[PDB]
Paper text:
We recently identified and characterized a fused toxin–antitoxin system called CapRelSJ46 that protects Escherichia coli against diverse phages. Activated CapRelSJ46 then pyrophosphorylates the 3′ end of transfer RNAs, which inhibits protein translation and restricts phage propagation. This alternative trigger, Gp54Bas11, is a small protein of 66 amino acids with unknown function.
This complex had ATP bound in the pyrophosphate donor site, stacked between R79 and R116, similar to that of other RelA/SpoT homologue enzymes, which indicated that the complex captures the active state of the enzyme. In the complex, the hydrophobic core of the Gp54Bas11 β-barrel binds to both the amphipathic anchor-1 and pseudo-ZFD of CapRelSJ46. In particular, G24, I25, S39, L41 and W43 of Gp54Bas11 contact the pseudo-ZFD β-sheet, and W53 of Gp54Bas11 becomes embedded between L270 and L276 of anchor-1 in CapRelSJ46 and I29 and L31 of Gp54Bas11. The interface is further stabilized by a polar network between D273, N275, K278 and S279 from CapRelSJ46 and Q47 and N50 from Gp54Bas11. Notably, binding of Gp54Bas11 to CapRelSJ46 involves a significant topological rearrangement. In the complex, the β-barrel of Gp54Bas11 unfolds with β1 and β6 becoming disordered, consistent with the entropy-driven binding suggested by ITC. Whereas Gp54Bas11 β2–β5 bind on one side of the pseudo-ZFD of CapRelSJ46 interacting with β7 and anchor-1, the long β1–β2 loop of Gp54Bas11 folds into β-strand β1′ and binds on the other side, making contacts with β8 of the pseudo-ZFD and effectively clamping the pseudo-ZFD. These interactions produce a ‘hybrid’ eight-stranded, antiparallel, twisted β-sheet comprising β-strands from both Gp54Bas11 and CapRelSJ46 that wraps around anchor-1 of CapRelSJ46. In addition, binding by β1′ of Gp54Bas11 to CapRelSJ46 β8 moves the pseudo-ZFD further from the active site compared with the unbound open state of CapRelSJ46, which probably primes the enzyme to bind and modify target tRNAs.
Numbering used by the authors:
A (entry chain B): 15 to 57
B (entry chain A): 13 to 92, 103 to 296, 304 to 372
Write the structure that this text describes.
Amino acid sequence: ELTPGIFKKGIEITIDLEEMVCYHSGLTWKVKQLTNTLWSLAG
Amino acid sequence: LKYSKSQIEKAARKIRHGCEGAEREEAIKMIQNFRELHLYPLMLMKNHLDRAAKKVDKENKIIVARRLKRLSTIIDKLERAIALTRMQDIGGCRAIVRNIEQLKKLKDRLVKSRSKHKILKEYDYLTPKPSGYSGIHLAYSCFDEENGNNPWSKTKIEVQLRTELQHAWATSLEIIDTLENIKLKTSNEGHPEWRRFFYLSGCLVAHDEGACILDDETIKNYQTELKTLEEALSVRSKLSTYTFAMKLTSDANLKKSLPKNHNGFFLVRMRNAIGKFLVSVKPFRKKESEQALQELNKDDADPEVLIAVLLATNNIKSLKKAYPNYFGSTNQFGRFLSRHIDT
Ligand SMILES: Nc1ncnc2c1ncn2[C@@H]1O[C@H](COP(=O)(O)OP(=O)(O)OP(=O)(O)O)[C@@H](O)[C@H]1O
Ligand SMILES: [Mg+2]
Ligand code: NA
């Protein structure tokens, strides 16, 4: 019954949680899980 | 438990004219019985299709999917003039092939098969439909002429044949249509820009695939329109963000953090750190939807936030189930769009 999605902001991004890598802004970012619901992307 | 085909056609007429109460509950019970009759032939056609796909591709790369059409979907279709006993797809199978040469090779094998299941209609959609949809549908009648005491006689099962790029287009159309709440199938009115985007990208998919070759002047004008529509709709960004948010909600640690009966929203946000970025996925109960929307507008107003999206968990769940390889498809479709826009 609720709206399936509300889009406010976004960019072209890809993430692979097996390789723990992310791709955005023409750069490669290393992924690390800080909490169950939180991640950091570092150079 | 034992309803005749006359009782089932009469039950379907009742739902069309808008029955209620005990009358509606009997009509739906007979239609559910008819729906269950398609299960054995659906699975039989699925193995028939898997056996024929393993013959055409010795690498075993053809992906085969199947689905029994939901009772609620059938009921909705009747009360919106398709006849229930004329419906070709209560059971539906699908083969996803590498290219058009593989597609035609699989069609020829299914057409030359000498079984009790007859192709009553071959639908050639290699030239895209007004929606932009392209591929091939085979309408089978299982146990068509050889029957006797067979309860599965003349059972209709649909077989869809598609290439990976035709499938990537269809997956992206379902993701946008679901998550953006644009009822493209429901109505033939509204969202002319999204309708035109999917039609032109569909035409360019069938050109690239070799399914339907367009002349050079048409390619040039379609690419110009595609660049225009894509900028207006922010297709590559919406498609990437939705896929990224869906990927994160499949994380194992995230799923234990969830309330056990989660059925609300997920708020996915990416922000700059004090080059470093923080990505969070915030679960919300269905009752806290107003709180979720308030938190979404705060992130939309923040200049440090690059991604801010709100997604209902039930919709994420059904798209992941319908499309196991949704991320391979949205990636391929986004790359295809970049090749035609940046020409
Ligand atoms: N032949 C098929 N084989 C496998 N999956 C299918 C087939 N037909 C539909 N599906 C998929 O099943 C899901 C449920 O779709 P649904 O039954 O509600 O509508 P539909 O069959 O695609 O279209 P329509 O209602 O217009 O006839 C969708 O993801 C759809 O792509
Ligand atoms: Mg269908
Ligand atoms: Na898929």
